[PDB]
Amino acid sequence: MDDLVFAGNKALYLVLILSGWPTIVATIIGLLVGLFQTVTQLQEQTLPFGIKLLGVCLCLFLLSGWYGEVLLSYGRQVIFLALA
Amino acid sequence: NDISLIALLAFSTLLPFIIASGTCFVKFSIVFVMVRNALGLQQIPSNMTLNGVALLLSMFVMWPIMHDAYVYFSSLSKHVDEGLDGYRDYLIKYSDRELVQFFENAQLKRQYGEETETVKRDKDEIEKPSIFALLPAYALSEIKSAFKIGFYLYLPFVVVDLVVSSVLLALGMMMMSPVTISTPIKLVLFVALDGWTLLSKGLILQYMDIA
Amino acid sequence: NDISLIALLAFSTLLPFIIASGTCFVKFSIVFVMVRNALGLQQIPSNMTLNGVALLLSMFVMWPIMHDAYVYFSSLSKHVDEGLDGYRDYLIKYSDRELVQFFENAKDEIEKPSIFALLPAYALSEIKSAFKIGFYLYLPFVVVDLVVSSVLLALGMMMMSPVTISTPIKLVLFVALDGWTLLSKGLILQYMDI
Amino acid sequence: KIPVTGSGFVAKDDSLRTFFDAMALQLKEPVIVSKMAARKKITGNFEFHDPNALLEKLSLQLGLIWYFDGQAIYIYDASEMRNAVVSLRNVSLNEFNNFLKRSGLYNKNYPLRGDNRKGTFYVSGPPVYVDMVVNAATMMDKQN
Amino acid sequence: GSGFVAKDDSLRTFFDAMALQLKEPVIVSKMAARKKITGNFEFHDPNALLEKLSLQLGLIWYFDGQAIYIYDASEMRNAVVSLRNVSLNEFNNFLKRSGLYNKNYPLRGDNRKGTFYVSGPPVYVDMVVNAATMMDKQN
Amino acid sequence: KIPVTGSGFVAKDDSLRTFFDAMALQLKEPVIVSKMAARKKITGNFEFHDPNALLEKLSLQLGLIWYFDGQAIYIYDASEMRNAVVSLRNVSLNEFNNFLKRSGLYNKNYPLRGDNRKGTFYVSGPPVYVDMVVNAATMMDKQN
Amino acid sequence: GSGFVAKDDSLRTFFDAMALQLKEPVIVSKMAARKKITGNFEFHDPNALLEKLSLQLGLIWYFDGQAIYIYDASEMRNAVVSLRNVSLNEFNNFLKRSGLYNKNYPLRGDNRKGTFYVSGPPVYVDMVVNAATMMDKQN
Amino acid sequence: IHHLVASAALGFARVAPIFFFLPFLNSGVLSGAPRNAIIILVALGVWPHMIPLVLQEAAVGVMLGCLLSWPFWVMHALGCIIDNQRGATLSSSSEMANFLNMFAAVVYLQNGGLVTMVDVLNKSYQLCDPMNECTPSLPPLLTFINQVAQNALVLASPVVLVLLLSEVFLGLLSRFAPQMNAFAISLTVKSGIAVLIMLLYFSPVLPDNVLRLSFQATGLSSWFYERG
């Protein structure tokens, strides 16, 4: 029981922490572009996607090999708890 | 010799009946299907195949136990009791204790009446349960054990799907199904982990041992 | 021949157990549906013709194996093992040697392993290799699925499903590449050389 | 480790097979308790100094039937008693009672009911007593 | 001297340890191999220790001249067999002259007749019945 | 690199099949151990200088039966001892014991129990001794 | 001098190398080719080394005039055969006059009777059974 | 002999809908080859001893299968509101609710589970044996839809109110500067707050309520009566 509680607490923790850096690197560049639009008046609502695509695709570029060694380290542990 | 084909049409359905109900084939078929639903595939890998691979591993394990029923072979029922001690001992080891006692008491309540003394756990030292109480309880105890393995197997992929559906909502791509992106990167988690040589490696070690 | 019609109908329900597990039909039929799902199709072409092309390609490497058993094959104890020796020197090629020792315990030149010990490892080795070469096919289509979905998002049309646009492009990327014949050439050259 | 001064058996929820095997030393024969008469339980402080008289009283208070055939003591409950009626074509009942008295299988609690010089009688008792009486009665007429 | 300190043994590792002082091998059945025993036992009179422990545990045993068979008490079977042309007093002299006569389980029957009643261990009953119907076949 | 310069066999968890083959040169016959008697294990420092008394002592301490038929030493465990009753039609027991004494297959540990000049007797022992005495007594009546 | 240096050889390639110092080919069975041997051996008295190795590894062997068959100890079989019109003594004279007489596994039986007991390697017992039952039909 | 087919086709009728409804017994985890062998073993193992008798016994089975599938519908409806508030479901106007249903099907299955399931099914023949015209008792059936919805709403009550305050505060942030595109700015953060808030009460609260909403054998008389 205490491992079923631990494995459920860690699956939600890894979802929270792996979707952390791409969702805070697409937030500062969602807010500072609009703060530039508060100084100079622009009425183009479809503007900060041009930076949001480069922000998410460059954050997923440097940490690409890092996600594989957190998914493999958690996926090998849960099967050892399953079988043994 | 077609006068015994009325019993051949019973023995050729009773021999797969024990296979699909009371042996280890039930655990292997549920785990193999639930890892197909864990990845998110519907047809492939074509469970006509998976009922053959699960039968090859179950006959691999059931080969020494069934062979003792052939080295041997009101009045014939006491002869078949001596021929069926290895199967009753295999069903005792892997069924549930709290569930066989339920099927034992409901049978005594069925046969003799409501004033029958309730059987407790302390019979287990010398008294052995019947073959009609182990056989329904073994199937449910392997449905419980295979669903227990399949939830653990299920968890990593759900971790992949909940980050993929989060980054497709960070970008403004809410009108985009995340299955078409996750299904490539859900397949690397099964080939870099070589789980086909890990589930079959572990499920054999639960029932037999090496060296 | 009423003692032989049972020996014909059981053989006709035994070959669907063997062809679907212990031949190259396993690796053949899986990739045809993974490339069927990579384009975004559900009912095209069917589930029936994809097992037909894979069965016709499956006997291209099994008919040279089956002819050796037809010429060769209580005297039937050692009669069967050499009739299947042309099938068991093929099953050691495409399986894992450490895995067949796991089933043989639970050199190889002086003694070939048991025939019932390496057929599950052959099946697991072809499901694993089909999943590996099946992951590769998905990637080009996923790129042309993310490009059109981010070009329409460069515009203001966030309420627009890109499946109505990506499906023309995905099957010109498979016919300008000549995809269907290209996969079958590599599947034949992985088993029988030219 | 076991401090009580006297001698006796203390049963705490014993189940009538482990209880009668404890009486199987004062009785000098092994006791065989059936399957239906082993579901009943008994608890209390007992002592055995003439167990052939103690077994008769507890077989009426609990409800049981017993039989001693020279080697063992069989115990069934009361609802397992069976009946039979058989006919002897060429030996008498007084001839069959001399075979039971001389061998040592004559049981005065379950006698044979019938006319003294005829061929038919009526026997009833425990299932090991009836299946011996019927089998020896139909195996003496075929000899004679 | 000697002995055996049993700690949660299973009545098959115990009666094999007694099978040195007893000068014969011991064959314990698998329905009497589920009972257990523990305690410090000293083997200085084994033929009376086996007789006492068969009654305290509830057991039946038999020694035919080569081994000692041990069953539990609920495996005792019985039969009644008819000899057409050989007396019981002659068959009982065959058992006395051979060595299979066991005074614990004798043959209950009329002294000059053909019918008797036998009961005991299953290896003793299935020998007496077979050697009696193979003595009607000889005559 | 080998220890103290005496003679002996050191057994570190062998399985009674690799152990008796080490004794199979002091005994001058090959040793055949059954499949059920190869699951027990032994561990210790042993010393063979007359092995027929060591095998007699270990067959009682471990629980085993054995038979030397003139060319090999068969070893079974005690739970494989089988028995049979066979009746001789045209030859006596003393005229069969003279065949066993002259042929050297007579074993004093498991003799033939029966009346001295009759046709029926009783054998018990290892399955290679019982399958030899049954077939050699059946095939001698059809000879005479 | 000659000799063989075995490093984890598989007991079929080891006994094939002794088939030149022995003057006959050596035929090793399937179950006996699973054991392994290693070490430096010197072949100068091969028939004295073959018996010493066949007792330490656990093997049986039989040389019939053309080859040396080698089995292991678990493959030894036995039989009993009844002759109707020839005795044991002239059948032993058939084995001595032919050259198939093996003094390690002789025939056990009364000297002028019909029954005897054979036990040895399977290429020996399957010859003695077929040669004994084909002399009664000739006589 | 030949009547046991009818005595196992009467057991199959009651057992089969329950199998159809429960999450650890459906077609996703039980393929066609072993499926029809288990339900004859269980139906022969629970027997206490004309076309519309199989329809009456099927109606008692659909009422029993909904009562045994009572605590998993609450966790699935919990997941569909947690997944709906963060986004990811407005393409029809799931992936998260299948995780809470798979979790509750294991945390129910460890402690007890199949014992109370076959205890309910064995007490069903002690009150509604066939040829006595049992019936699923209409006047409590009408509030069954309401009960699951109420339980799901109270269970999910934190995460909706927190995501509602995140929408009022982000709506207040746009009144100070309307050039923000605050519709899509909230869409990046609500899927992280709907995970962080449910992390604080996933462990201590959620495995209790599955053992609280589980239907037991003591309430069978309030849901099944007899006409006879």
Contact F136 G119 (CB under 8 A): no
Q: Is B174 on the interface with H (CB under 8 A)?
A: yes
Residues of D in contact with E78 (CB under 8 A): 69, 128, 132
The whole-angstrom separation of Cα F79 and Cα H175 is 92
Resolution of this model in Å is 3.5
The token duo for H177 is: 């500067």
CA distance E74 to B65: 27
Under 8 Å CB-to-CB from H87, ≥6 apart: which residues?
B169, B174, H187, H190, H191
Which of A44, A53, A54, A60 to probe the C interface (max C CBs under 10 A)?
A53
Would the CB atoms of C110 and G30 count as touching at under 8 Å? no
Question: Best interface-test mutation with C: which of B9, B175, B179 has the largest number of C CBs within 10 A?
Answer: B175
Tell me which of B117, B120, B121, B130 to substitute to probe the interface with D (most D C-beta atoms closer than 10 Å). B117
- d(Cα E53, Cα E6) in Å, to the nearest integer? 14
| CA–CA distance, A20 with C65 (Å, rounded to integer) | 56
Degrees (nearest 5) of the Cα angle B198, B203, B204? 100
Residue pair E87/D143 in contact (Cβ under 8 Å)? The answer is no
Alpha-carbon distance of A8 to A28, in angstroms, equals: 31
Omega of the bond prior to E46 within 30 degrees of 0, cis? no
SS3 F68: strand
Q: Are the C-beta atoms of residues E6 and E38 closer than 8 Å to each other?
A: yes
Phi and psi (nearest 5°) for D85? -140, 125
CA–centroid distance for G76 within its chain: 10
C25-56 burial code (b ≥16 CB/10 A, e <16): bbbbbbbbbbbbbbbbeeeeeeeeebbeebee
Asked if G85 is an interface residue toward chain F (Cβ–Cβ < 8 A), one would say no
As a whole number of Å, the end-to-end CA separation of chain C is 44
Is there a contact between D21 and E58 (Cβ–Cβ < 8 Å)?
A: yes
Q: What chain B residue is nearest to C118 in terms of C-alpha separation?
A: B56
Total Cβ atoms within 10 A of residue C129: 17
Among A79, C118, C136, C96, smallest CA distance to B195 is for A79
- Cβ–Cβ below 8 Å for A49 and B171: yes
Chain H's closest residue to A40, CA to CA, is H179
End-to-end CA gap in chain A = 15
CB contact under 8 A, B162 and H95: yes
| Integer Rg of chain H from CA | 23
E127–F122 CB contact, under 8 Å: yes
Report d(CA E39, CA C117) in Å as an integer.
Answer: 48
Neighbours of D82 (CB within 10 A): 13
G113 in reach of chain F (CB within 8 A): yes
User: Are residues G56 and F104, on separate chains, in Cβ contact within 8 Å?
Assistant: no
Q: Say which DSSP state D36 is in.
A: G
Assess B170–E contact: CB distance below 8 Å, yes or no: no
Token reading at H146: 């309401």
Strand boundaries in chain F, DSSP class E: 9-14, 31-33, 42-46, 65-68, 73-76, 82-87, 113-114, 120-125
Give ∠ CA D131-D136-D137 in degrees, rounded to 5.
Answer: 100
Which residues in chain H have Cβ-Cβ distances shorter than 8 Å to A34? 177, 179-181
User: Which structure tokens are listed for H11?
Assistant: 């057991």
Inter-chain residue contact H202 with A12, CB threshold 8 Å = yes
Residues 6+ apart with CB under 8 A from D36: D76, D77, D79, D80
Could you tell me where the beta strands, DSSP code E, fall in chain B?
none
For E91, the token pair is 């068959």
Who among B173, B190, B196 is closest to C124 (CB)? B196
Give the separation between CA A28 and CA A34, rounded to whole angstroms. Answer: 10
- What residues in D contact E105, CB-CB < 8 Å? 71
